[PDB]
Design a protein around this ligand. Structure first.
Ligand SMILES: O=c1[nH]cc(F)c(=O)[nH]1
Ligand SMILES: O=c1[nH]cc(F)c(=O)[nH]1
Ligand SMILES: O=c1[nH]cc(F)c(=O)[nH]1
Ligand SMILES: O=c1[nH]cc(F)c(=O)[nH]1
Lengths: 99, 99, 102, 102
């Protein structure tokens, strides 16, 4: 079913790459998108494979970047017995616009 | 900054309209979007004003509906001393497709 | 660079299948996507976007979609021109949602 | 019905402002939006979408945007035709992000 998200925002931290038990890389950053008295929303992005590593190369805290992807929800149990409901954006592609 | 979300999914419950302290209506439903071994993500939608009331009229649990909007994050403290981080989709428009 | 298009419309004619010399299928319909917002005259307008799908999907749109089918489209917007130079724009679909069983 | 377009490109020429008889401004540029994905020949392609903005925004795009400016666009896709009947498609922008200070 149609599920589409396009974003331009700035990374809050540096991208965090980590290596999965299957052996494939998984990227993590947060995009801060000023809303178009100014507030910004903070979407969490997830990238995989080739795209994931590129973001570790070129993107860093404060980089302006564009994102095209699908919007996903997962749930897990955190370090204690609590159920975290997460919503995030898995990026089909990630465009480096300006630092 | 660019922030755009388009979705087609099915309502999980019936839409919940409620009336705000300012006097304006605020709509609430959850959209279940099968991903294009089938899983679905559950995005929470928010509508306001005219659009909000329409969804109470015409949409109900299981209605297939399309959504165009922006992606927003808010935080609050829940009934106990816990900080809920929420991400949701405020709908610029809501299209009734099929029940 | 970012380039994305989401659309819900009804097909004006029936879908047209063709094959490239390369061996890959190419589906064709044009969508009638009513505007959600009324215009200054208070009347309701429609745009007619031309969609293109490729490979396996093109066969599915040929199988299940027909004139008047309600359908969703996710894709990018592409511009080409060729000789009698005609300026064409249409929507190459990454995916196509059939919003009707028929 | 859903109809949405997001784009990031560079302007090919400088923005063109005009005014309607109604008194409302209408901005014009065309964007060059490089494809993110390479083609079968391994070369990089670009689409040239024509954008339209209205009212106050049109003046801002005229003020700050110029040929080669990197810019973001959020809007819908509209189809019109008129007499010498020319088939035009372009992107009426709900909003326009200036991705460069210049
Ligand atoms: O400012 C932030 N808010 C929320 C986050 F998840 C984050 O990384 N940074
Ligand atoms: O199945 C559901 N998951 C999450 C929700 F918030 C909801 O309302 N329904
Ligand atoms: O109703 C229509 N108007 C214009 C077209 F090109 C078409 O296919 N159908
Ligand atoms: O490089 C260009 N190609 C085609 C066009 F219409 C244009 O404006 N610029």
């Amino acid at each position: 079913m149609l599920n589409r998200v396009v974003l331009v925002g700035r990374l809050t931290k540096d991208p965090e790459l980590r290596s999965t038990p299957n052996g494939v890389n998984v990227g993590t950053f947060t995009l801060a998108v000023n809303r178009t008295e100014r507030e910004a929303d903070f979407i969490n992005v997830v990238v995989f494979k080739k795209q994931a590593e590129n973001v570790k190369n070129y993107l860093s805290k404060g980089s302006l970047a564009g994102v095209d992807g699908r919007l996903q929800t997962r749930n897990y149990e955190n370090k204690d017995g609590q159920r975290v409901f997460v919503t995030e954006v898995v990026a089909d592609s990630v465009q480096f616009l300006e630092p």
